[PDB]
Amino acid sequence: QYEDGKQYTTLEKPVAGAPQVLEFFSFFCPHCYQFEEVLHISDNVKKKLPEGVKMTKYHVNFMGGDLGKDLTQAWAVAMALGVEDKVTVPLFEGVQKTQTIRSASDIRDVFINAGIKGEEYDAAWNSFVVKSLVAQQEKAAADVQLRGVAAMFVNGKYQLNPQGMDTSNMDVFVQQYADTVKYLSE
Amino acid sequence: QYEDGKQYTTLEKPVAGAPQVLEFFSFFCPHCYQFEEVLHISDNVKKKLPEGVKMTKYHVNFMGGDLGKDLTQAWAVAMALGVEDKVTVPLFEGVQKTQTIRSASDIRDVFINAGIKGEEYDAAWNSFVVKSLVAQQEKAAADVQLRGVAAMFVNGKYQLNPQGMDTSNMDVFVQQYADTVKYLSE
Amino acid sequence: QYEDGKQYTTLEKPVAGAPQVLEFFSFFCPHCYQFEEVLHISDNVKKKLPEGVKMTKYHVNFMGGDLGKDLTQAWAVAMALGVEDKVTVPLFEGVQKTQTIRSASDIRDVFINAGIKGEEYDAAWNSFVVKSLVAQQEKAAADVQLRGVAAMFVNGKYQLNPQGMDTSNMDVFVQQYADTVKYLSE
Amino acid sequence: QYEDGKQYTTLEKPVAGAPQVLEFFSFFCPHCYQFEEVLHISDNVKKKLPEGVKMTKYHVNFMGGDLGKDLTQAWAVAMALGVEDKVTVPLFEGVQKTQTIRSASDIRDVFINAGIKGEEYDAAWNSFVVKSLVAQQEKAAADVQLRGVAAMFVNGKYQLNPQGMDTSNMDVFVQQYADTVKYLSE
Amino acid sequence: QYEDGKQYTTLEKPVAGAPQVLEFFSFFCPHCYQFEEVLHISDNVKKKLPEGVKMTKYHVNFMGGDLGKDLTQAWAVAMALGVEDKVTVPLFEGVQKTQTIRSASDIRDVFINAGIKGEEYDAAWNSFVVKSLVAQQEKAAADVQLRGVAAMFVNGKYQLNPQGMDTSNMDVFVQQYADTVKYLSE
Amino acid sequence: QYEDGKQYTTLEKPVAGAPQVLEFFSFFCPHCYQFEEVLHISDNVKKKLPEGVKMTKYHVNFMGGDLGKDLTQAWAVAMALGVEDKVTVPLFEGVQKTQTIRSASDIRDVFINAGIKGEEYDAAWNSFVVKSLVAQQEKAAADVQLRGVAAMFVNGKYQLNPQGMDTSNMDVFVQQYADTVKYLSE
């Protein structure tokens, strides 16, 4: 069955005000690229979420240095304009696969190609909303004392532990994962 | 009497989760020195504050560039250790009066001379608490779409307007100011 | 009547060569903002000054640290170009009201908008005249052993004392102030 | 005989209020070291000056950057304490010969070894007198539009031109120099 | 001839950064309805403007409450899309003449009928450019301390004064008005 | 037990940079003579102070008028020469007991008899260290807003309240007094 220490551990300092399903990642995170592109953990977890429970994705600085910071802003922008779905994959592929995203410019060019108007990306980039979203992201990462580049917590109480799941068969891993979320979301 | 647009304006986007009495400042903001060292606004406002209402101070980046950022973290440290009272003035004098705080090191010694153990300051400086506090401070300044270096907000609804008070007599200005806060704190 | 210790005190070291009416200020001083914009002391004093007696204004460094120093050079430039009246208010507002003057560039902006050609402000800024003016300002603040950011001295002998004037009614205060100057200017 | 352009040139902007014999120098200047230690210009000029005419020495900043500034304030303390004779040489050697004066502490010890109590050197250092004396030096340098580190002006009207004197024999140069000052000092 | 107080007054606080020709209005202001439809001020002024000087129109809130806000944003959209000419009249008639615009929806249908795609209007409506344009309009009105719903300023220095022009004959008032602009625009 | 308002009160404006144990007196002060000569408060307090904590005595001007100022410089001289123990009692007796100190001379005769050479007493008197020390004493008195001629502060926070101690038995008063200091010195 689901046991603490098994497919999930519990925070000795539960984070209040934390979103129901919180995932941190990085466009530099290789397995995170796998979780999205290949496994589709996001979708499969989102599909089994009770009505009302929303999935939140923050990005982390620790990896990439400056491009690490710029990507976080770009994610905030992505969140502000609501074009996450449009830009998530191209950002992963541009950074890791095609290795075409070497600077802020390249990230811009990604949003532009997804349909966002240069002038608007730039407006958004400099907005206060984005400014606060970034700080929001940076704070959430600090509150749960995030050590790694990827992690997912539920209700700021628990943290998913994939190292504690049947990894022999991915299709099993996925379902077991999604399940632990839904289970923990109550 | 107290009117919106007179001694205080209202935010078109009330910030939820914001502290009751929030003041933004910078150790580079010289006129702010006069507020602390000369006028003692903080004290006078804190003295006329209803029971429960708490005064909150956040530092801002925009001014001093890097030293600006370091000072902000330092303020986060000050908050984390609860040594605000001990380090405020020295920090003001060091940066502005004596001009001896030209680097993070100098900021460390101000705290040191205030009684904080170098080792401990250095511990807090890299703590997650402080990392979070800084983000908290950055976020808040964005939420209230802060434009300048100084300002004060009550209940995330109103923003004090000193430009709308009797400045002819400071003793009058101070009381009138402290009054607008208490009044707006309900 | 006018008594030493009442509306004015006398220097135990009368400064020789000091201008007839000498006022020290800083575009960072609260009290100073009021005196100019609100009470208009400068005007009211200048208006009751006997024929010949000139009013001299010097800016002070102790406050603002580097900006303090820069504003002082800017004031020397103001004097160098004879544009005092043009730039006084803007500087007070930019620094204290709109909080737009955060650096030397900003102080420069103000001169340009007031009609001074960028190239000419820049020329004056680096002139020996201005270099001297500053020194002149710095020396005077030291000769009268200036402890604060604002003060007025007459004939290098007396220092006005507003703390010893009827502050209950500003229109009275102003007149009483202006009178003490005229009185002391002989 | 003595001709403008020969052993002296005249200022196109005679400085009013300037000392009778005004010499500018630097504890970093070679020419200035030669003059004092080897040539003894000061003495010889002072020995031929009419009764009443006083020789005045001011230090310049433009050389040594910060130590340049520290040396100037030190010179002012020298002037404030009246120990110019006691410290002139040691400062010249400490800087140029033994190269032991690398910081403000080094200047201090020199005064200490010259008989000035530390506590007092320190007191003088922060005095208003010194503060003024520095500014005084700083202005005077500006007024005569000093381009170089060394130079001598008489009555704010003329500037000695050693380049135009007989330099083949040092004892002739010194006398000839000492003479142009006495001549110009009337 | 053109005299201050006659066909134009001058701001005691000239706004720096304000556009050359800045007009404020509201789709609720009858006065404005008259100026556009009947008098054609805008056209006449624009026709007499020197090469380079651009005419700018900002809308204002204080009139219409919420609909006042929506029109402001709708104006911003008109500006963002550059369809001012296409929608100005219909907005005036719809609000004032036919009185058909009773809600944000009616504004959208107007743009739609003018030739803007619903999807595109909706895009622009939410864009950041527009969000900024709105803030831009809101601030400009504040900088010039606009009291009325309608006003026109030139170079942030002068404010046109129609109340001091020959109103007996409209064709004269218009010409007189356009002229004051052209004159004041230098 | 020790309660605020009981044997001590607290400053609503704690003084930063203030010595650990500060005592203000005047050689004109009566109970100060008791405290020293009879009670020996100074000794008994200094004898119970933690290692490192130093006792500091400043003199006040408000009493004696000019002799008051003179006595304050003379105390400054005592401090600079470090002869406080030698001259304290004599000054008390000369002023109050034998009434032989009626002018500066008389105070000088005291120093000379204590062993200080006239010439040295005179050098010290005019030193910058004494000038500064005086200023230091005057400032401190003001910072703690000293109202009376005598008072003792600990850590710039607390002010001893002898009016709230068992005065029935002096040996009790003493200990209780010295105790409250030690207690407050932490």
Residue ranges of the domains in chain D?
1-186
C-alpha dihedral sign at C73, C75, C79, C80: positive
Residues F58, F133: Cα–Cα separation, whole Å: 9
Residues A148, A160: Cα–Cα separation, whole Å: 13
CA dihedral C101, C103, C104, C107 (to 10 degrees): 0
Residues F22, F154: Cα–Cα separation, whole Å: 6
Measure CB to CB from residue B135 to each of A17, A129, A139 and give the nearest one.
Answer: A139
- What distance, in Å, lies between the first and last C-alpha atoms of chain C? 16
Is residue B136 less than 8 Å (CB to CB) from chain A? yes
| Length reported for chain A | 186
Strand partners, A154: A21, A158
Tokens 């100073």 belong to residue: C32
Residues B81, A19: Cα–Cα separation, whole Å: 28
Strand partners, F9: F159
Measure CB to CB from residue A143 to each of B132, B138, B142 and give the nearest one.
Answer: B132
Contact residues, chain A, for B17 at CB < 8 Å:
17
Mutate to test the interface with A, among E126, E128, E132 (most CBs of A within 10 A): E128
Token code pair at residue A124 = 């958004």
Token code pair at residue C43 = 């005007």
Instruction: Classify F21 as helix, strand or coil.
Output: strand
Residues A117, A111: Cα–Cα separation, whole Å: 8
CB B121 within 8 A of CB B148: no
- Give the burial string for F109-119 (b: 16+ CB within 10 Å, else e): bbbeebebeee
Residues B77, B126: Cα–Cα separation, whole Å: 9
Instruction: Classify C65 as helix, strand or coil.
Output: coil
Q: Are strands C158-160 and C151-154 parallel, antiparallel or unpaired?
A: antiparallel
Of D174, D130, D186, nearest to D7 by C-alpha is D174
Got the DSSP string for E78-130? HHHHT-HHHHHHHHHIIIIIS----SHHHHHHHHHHHT--HHHHHHHHH-HHH
Instruction: Classify D151 as helix, strand or coil.
Output: strand
Instruction: Classify C147 as helix, strand or coil.
Output: coil
Is residue B84 less than 8 Å (CB to CB) from chain F? no
Residues E138, B26: Cα–Cα separation, whole Å: 27
Instruction: Classify D2 as helix, strand or coil.
Output: coil
Residues B124, B117: Cα–Cα separation, whole Å: 11
Residues E115, E134: Cα–Cα separation, whole Å: 22
Tokens 């007198």 belong to residue: D129
Dihedral class, residue E148 (left if φ above 0, else alpha if ψ from -120 to 50, else beta): beta
Q: Do B31 and C96 touch (CB under 8 A)?
A: yes
Taking residue D12's Cβ as centre, other Cβ atoms within 10 Å add up to 6
Residues F28, F61: Cα–Cα separation, whole Å: 10
Contact residues, chain F, for B89 at CB < 8 Å:
16
DSSP D27: T
Give the distance from CA F126 to its chain's centroid: 22
Token code pair at residue D46 = 């002072």
Residue E77: its H or E element: helix E65-81
**CATH code 2.60.40.10 for E1-186:** no
- Helix-helix angle A128-143:A66-81, to 10 degrees: 120
Residues C66, C52: Cα–Cα separation, whole Å: 36
Residue F8: its H or E element: strand F8-10
Dihedral class, residue D99 (left if φ above 0, else alpha if ψ from -120 to 50, else beta): left
CB E63 within 8 A of CB E27: no
Residue F140: its H or E element: helix F128-143
CB C170 within 8 A of CB C164: no
Angle at B43 between CA B39 and CA B45, to 5 degrees: 95
How far A91 CA lies from chain B's nearest CA (Å)?
25
Taking residue E52's Cβ as centre, other Cβ atoms within 10 Å add up to 7
- Give the burial string for C61-90 (b: 16+ CB within 10 Å, else e): bbbbbbbbbbbbbbbbbbbbbebeebbbbb
Strand order in the sheet with A151-154: A8-10, A158-160, A151-154, A21-25, A55-59
- Specify the amino acid at residue C115: G
3-state secondary structure chain B: CCCECCCEEECCCCCCCCCCEEEEECCCCHHHHHHHHHHCHHHHHHHCCCCCCCEEEEECCCCCHHHHHHHHHHHHHHHHHCCHHHHHHHHHHHHHHCCCCCCHHHHHHHHHHCCCCHHHHHHHHCCHHHHHHHHHHHHHHHHCCCCCCCEEEECCCEEECHHHCCCCCHHHHHHHHHHHHHHHCC
Strand partners, F153: F22, F159
Residues C48, C94: Cα–Cα separation, whole Å: 30
Token code pair at residue F175 = 């200990």
Of B21, B19, B42, B46, nearest to B32 by C-alpha is B42
CB E55 within 8 A of CB E46: yes
CB proximity under 8 Å: C 13-52 to B: 26, 28-31, 33-34, 37-39
In a 13 Å sphere around the CA of C82, the CA atoms on its Cβ side amount to 0
Got the DSSP string for chain A? ---BTTTEEE-SSPPTT--SEEEEE-TT-HHHHIIIIII-HHHHHHHTSPTT--EEEEE-STTTTHHHHHHHHHHHHHHHHT-HHHHHHHHHIIIIIS----SHHHHHHHHHHTT--HHHHHHHHHSHHHHHHHHHHHHHHHHTT--SS-EEEETTTEEE-GGGS--SSHHHHHHHHHHHHHHHT-
Q: Do C128 and D143 touch (CB under 8 A)?
A: yes
C-alpha dihedral sign at A114, A117, A119, A120: negative
Is residue D142 less than 8 Å (CB to CB) from chain C? yes
Mutate to test the interface with F, among D79, D119, D121 (most CBs of F within 10 A): D119
Tell me the CA distances in angstroms from A138 to A58, A62, A76, A105, A145, one per residue in order. 9, 10, 11, 22, 11
Given resolution (angstroms)? 2.8
- Specify the amino acid at residue A59: H
* CB-based touch F/D (3+ pairs, under 8 A): yes
Residues D139, C136: Cα–Cα separation, whole Å: 7
Contact residues, chain D, for F131 at CB < 8 Å:
123, 127
Q: Do A136 and B139 touch (CB under 8 A)?
A: yes
Residues B112, C92: Cα–Cα separation, whole Å: 36
